[PDB]
Amino acid sequence: DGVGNASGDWHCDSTWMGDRVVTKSTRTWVLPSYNNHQYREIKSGSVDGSNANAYFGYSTPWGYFDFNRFHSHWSPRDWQRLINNYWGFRPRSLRVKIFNIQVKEVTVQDSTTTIANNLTSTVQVFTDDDYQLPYVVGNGTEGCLPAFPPQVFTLPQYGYATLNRDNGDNPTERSSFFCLEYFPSKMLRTGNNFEFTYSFEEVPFHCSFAPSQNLFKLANPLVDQYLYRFVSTSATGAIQFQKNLAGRYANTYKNWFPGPMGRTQGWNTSSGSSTNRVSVNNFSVSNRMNLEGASYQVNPQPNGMTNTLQGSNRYALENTMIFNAQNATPGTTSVYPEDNLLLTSESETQPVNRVAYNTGGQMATNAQNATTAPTVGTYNLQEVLPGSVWMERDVYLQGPIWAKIPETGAHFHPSPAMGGFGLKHPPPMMLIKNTPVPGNITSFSDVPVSSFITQYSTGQVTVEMEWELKKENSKRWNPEIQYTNNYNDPQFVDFAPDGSGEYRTTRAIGTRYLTRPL
Amino acid sequence: DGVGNASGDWHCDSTWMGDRVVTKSTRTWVLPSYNNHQYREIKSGSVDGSNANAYFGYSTPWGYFDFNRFHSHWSPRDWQRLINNYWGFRPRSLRVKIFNIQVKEVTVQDSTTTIANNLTSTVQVFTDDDYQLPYVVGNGTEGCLPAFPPQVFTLPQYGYATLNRDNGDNPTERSSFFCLEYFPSKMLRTGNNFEFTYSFEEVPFHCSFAPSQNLFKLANPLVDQYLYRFVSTSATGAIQFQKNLAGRYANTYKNWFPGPMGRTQGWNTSSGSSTNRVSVNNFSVSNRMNLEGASYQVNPQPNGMTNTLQGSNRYALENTMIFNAQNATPGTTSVYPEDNLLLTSESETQPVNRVAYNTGGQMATNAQNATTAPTVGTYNLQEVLPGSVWMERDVYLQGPIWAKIPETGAHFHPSPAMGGFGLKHPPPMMLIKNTPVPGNITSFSDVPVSSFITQYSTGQVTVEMEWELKKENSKRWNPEIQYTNNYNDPQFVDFAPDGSGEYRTTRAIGTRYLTRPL
Amino acid sequence: DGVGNASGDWHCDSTWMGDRVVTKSTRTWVLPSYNNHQYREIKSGSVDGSNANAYFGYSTPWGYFDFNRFHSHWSPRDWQRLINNYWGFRPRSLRVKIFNIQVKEVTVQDSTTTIANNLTSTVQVFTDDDYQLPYVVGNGTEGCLPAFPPQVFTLPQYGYATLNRDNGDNPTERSSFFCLEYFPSKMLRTGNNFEFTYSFEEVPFHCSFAPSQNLFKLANPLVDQYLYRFVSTSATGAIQFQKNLAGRYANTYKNWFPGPMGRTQGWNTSSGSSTNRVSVNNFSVSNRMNLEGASYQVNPQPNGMTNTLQGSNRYALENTMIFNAQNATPGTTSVYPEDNLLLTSESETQPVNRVAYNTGGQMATNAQNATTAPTVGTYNLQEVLPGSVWMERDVYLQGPIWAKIPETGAHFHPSPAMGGFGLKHPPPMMLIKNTPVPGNITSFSDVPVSSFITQYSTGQVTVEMEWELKKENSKRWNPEIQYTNNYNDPQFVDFAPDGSGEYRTTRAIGTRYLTRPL
């Protein structure tokens, strides 16, 4: 529209209206000119002695907007209002708007770097509505809209891995190259803006409640069962039985079973670090799955287990989501102690989910005879069974919202391991790049020009999300557990900027506070 | 309405009308004043050396109506008419009515206990329509409407277990107390009655047929497959093949597989008791699952297996439903032989379901080389796989009808292990209690009165259920197996009262008699 | 209506609908025949050496329904939902219903006490709509509807004090006798019920929030004031000034002042009991007001002060509401330690209200000269001043809801000291009594009969209250403090019945959790 007219306003807000809540976030972004306007074939061989690290892909000159983290939409107080009062929620719609674009020309001379705006430069933007591009958004990576509204952020560079040959850095006949310029995109000069809208598919509500009953103790503790159980064999081999008494939950017949489990090693946090094995390199003794001839770690394991047992300091670390308390630099290889990190605990699900670091149980391992005694053996892993129930991983304020279900034609219970909503058609990738501007070209050449004017753009982005809420409807008499701002002798305010302006966050806030009977 | 006017009639009947059958049952109940009108915190530590027996809960002064057993609705003859003629059935609706209430005042003086009616006393009744209370009805417990119509029964006392801490008798911050008086209930004096109606959710038909074909022998025995199989390696290592011939079912390619299995120990009934290991305590060598740090027995195991192999006397007792031939007293710890009990056999499902006490099969356990021979190892347990089929547990005349699916947000194939229909919203809990009547209180006190007049109530209850039937539609030429009243030299009539008036039942009647090809 | 027909149902519930919440409570009561149907002149002289204890009054044969406590209407969980999510609330309407009346005849013979119902006996009920009777309901006395729904309670006996002469037990010419039979009342036999409705007058919302700013630090800490202050006098007597700098809150000019205060003694709870004066009898050294020649203690003092200073263990006990953790017997004179009681803390109001046990400040006490130095003196009490602000006492789950404003024709800020809503026309007194039934009178006499049949009645009472809520509307970013069910190593569930059936309550729950800037 115009150089001296704003193409949009600043909208950050939450509006609660019954069973709906609309969140609005606006952030300032900055887009670098990645790769110098070129596509590059990126590849890697075996790194750290693991050929599962090998890949073949492409880095593109495009950047992308990632809105896949709860804190990009929810302030800590609104999150508290959500988890203390509702049984569940789910995304309904999304509206994105990119505006107030500013393209800057950078010029370095002799020890001098000036910056001036280029009023005629454009920025290109498109959304991948048909999912024709490798969707890299739901894999727990950096670059999402920052939690704290005033924080300015750089858009991450779009890249992808395709097929590599024999766990090496070579491509195969099936490796695919995708050209992002081969999509129709809108071009924006300083007065133009871009708007996009999207609606989520019917997805089940995330469960924001913990069970107030144990799965194996659902029977009335005052009445016996009209069922009998084999208890022994007489001195002559006659089978003997007894009635299952009231309250003896170790013996009652069960109708339902706990979800699938796969044993993972348990480690003690600090209080119990003296009981941990010393100097052990976890990779060699970790849970791994094989695929195409290589072994990959599979944290945080499939859903169905609890990583800790409420009241203990032992964690099944590979079944745990681990966040940094602060934003880290790219490529850091420092070894962090637990004092800098935020460990998540899924102990609220222990009345239903089995403990990840213990054996799942025991089964018969032979045929009993008058000469051979009955034998049992414990099992470390057990997959899904008919009539089994479990609770999915909880969502966190600083964790992912959705994940795209891989299109293969066959899947089971499409719920991403890192938590969130599994979607067949998630919010489309929104790509953006600075349109190239050639330097001073005087003569002709059939070779593509390589000399460009260095630029970078900036602007604002606003994301509006409507969420549907599930009202709590309990008849519990006594008070419930609530997430509360409880600190003893605070030296600073959590979820607030400190003296240096840095946003501080000392806790990973889950969703499970309210209870429900089974 | 009035003291001298009946508030309802006696309806016991079955009406067959095409693909529908309506059952009506009326019984006389008696409600004691449980706990003396108080709520009590009930708890237990480790019992019988098992901390899975520990619990923390509440016993309430309420009683409840349980209609969750087939014989509370079906006479033995109607059950026979059902299982000999239909392929399946399922619940459609339910109507309950409580009437002809009589409250009796009990007064004991010096070695004298008189009983008079209290015309002004009430009884309180409510149904938990929103499932806000711990549903204790579908866990195979006593207290259901008796099988024989003239039998008067006592309503069981409502109680529940909530969360306990570290497998002990202490509560946790999440333990929930539910006050039943915090629900709106109808109050009834002698002339009043209470009626309730409910409709079942679309649930799949229970299958009342046995397969007349084996899962691995579905191929035409007269034609070969156009498929070849690896049979060996030559003296030089060349792989060799052969065509899969007609009728050689051990070698045909299969399209479908048997359901999941988990080996359980097998024991011989009497005929073969001399081949059983002697003096063995089953608990230590039983199939158990771990949950929250404790091990629980999980009878009757998940669906997918047959507990016996038709033609043998060996049973996988932990995969078996065991009923008493008669009603037992509360808390009995006698050790019963198999002569007093009714063992159920699921052998009709053996053409499809794997045998619970045998190994499930064998798989490769290494990589074959010119130096290492191919090795295989048997597996005792195997969970669900794509393209697998199995048959659910059969229902019995003396067994449960439904079970409530635990609300967790994630489950697989919600079919209760004890058989029946898995429901998200089952018939609501119907609670009832005698309204308290204070004794002679003369002075004031801020402390709740503890002195009450002792009462108990009685009345009639009628339950009407509509069932939907699936007609048999077979082209089998020869006669089918039918359940029949066949006894040799009967000393009494089964399913009839004996000389002392006691109702006798010598057999557990299943549902699988008709056959169907796969 | 009828002997065998219930005249009402049981309604206990809470229904939240936007800015309104309707609470319903039903309880069972028992009414003794107080005084044996007679009015008695009750009086007392000086008790415990205090003639403020003298009184002259009347005890009547009537009982009354008291609904003036929050826990008679709010379950602990609904209270938590209220205080964690709203900024305020206020009563809108009330509906009361008394039904299912049962009159019992008591007859004691030789060491035998039988109880039978008297179907023709009545109970009398009336409400004092015009406030013509001494309103004894809002003075923190026992007898209200019990907190726990299943608890049966005795109605307290209605009595009142009128004028006594010279602090003695004699009446004056102005002492008034009120005959309750001189009001029209409804008579109820077993089939009848009584209903009453009432609407509250526009009353201001109770404030359920704590200030997140201090009253004396409202100025921007980054900007100075354009005001100067007198700081000293030169060596020649010239007055000198300085500008009030940014953030120096000790010197900024203020626009508002803290509410009124009246120093009360401070005492240390247990942690600091070694610093308390030993063996001191509080009455002689307590805060007292004189009236009609006698001195009365005036706990909990007028509004405007905080009784504790967050972070300390010292309490201004006379400015504190003290509840028992359990119901106590009538007339107990035991000396309780703080381990049995629930002390309330108003520290949330300290940013605005002055500390009750410290001096209020200091003022000039002379006229400065070249010979006399300026002198200041501290003041222990200070009443209301123009431009002063304070916060009223908080309400508790176990405290009073309203108080009747004394009709005198002149009052200031009608807010009861014990907290709650001050009303000119509060819910009317609801009186009830057992109609007298003469014994066997054979001959005539002009003297009123004294021989009566001993009876007592019982029934149910339901109270429905509509409350209006004030939605929280904050822009605070970081999480707020919330009331939470947090206990470490619980041996029992708080706000739940224990093993003996007794309802336990270990905490007084206030209303101030959310914050607001000033």
Numbering used by the authors:
A (entry chain A), B (entry chain A), C (entry chain A): 209 to 726
Would you copy out the relevant sentences from the publication that reported this structure?
Adeno-associated virus (AAV) is a small ssDNA satellite virus of high interest (in recombinant form) as a safe and effective gene therapy vector. Seeking understanding of the spectrum of interactions, goat AAVGo.1 is investigated, because its host is the species most distant from human with reciprocal cross-species cell susceptibility. The AAV5 clade also includes AAVGo.1 (18, 19), which was isolated from deceased neonatal domesticated goat ileum.
The AAVGo.1 cryo-EM structure of a complex with a PKD12 fragment of AAVR at 2.4 Å resolution shows PKD1 bound with minimal change in virus structure. Displacements of ~1 Å are observed between PKD1 backbone carbons, and the shift appears to be a rotation around Arg353 that remains essentially unmoved. The complex of AAVGo.1 bound to PKD12 differed in modest ways at the VR-VII and VR-IX interfaces. In AAVGo.1, however, these residues are replaced by Ser442 and Ala443, and interactions with PKD1 Lys399 are absent. Therefore, AAV5 VR-IV has unique contacts with the PKD1 C terminus absent in the AAVGo.1-PKD1 complex. The AAV5 VR-VII residue Gln532 makes contact with PKD1 (Ile349), and the Ile349 interaction is absent in AAVGo.1.
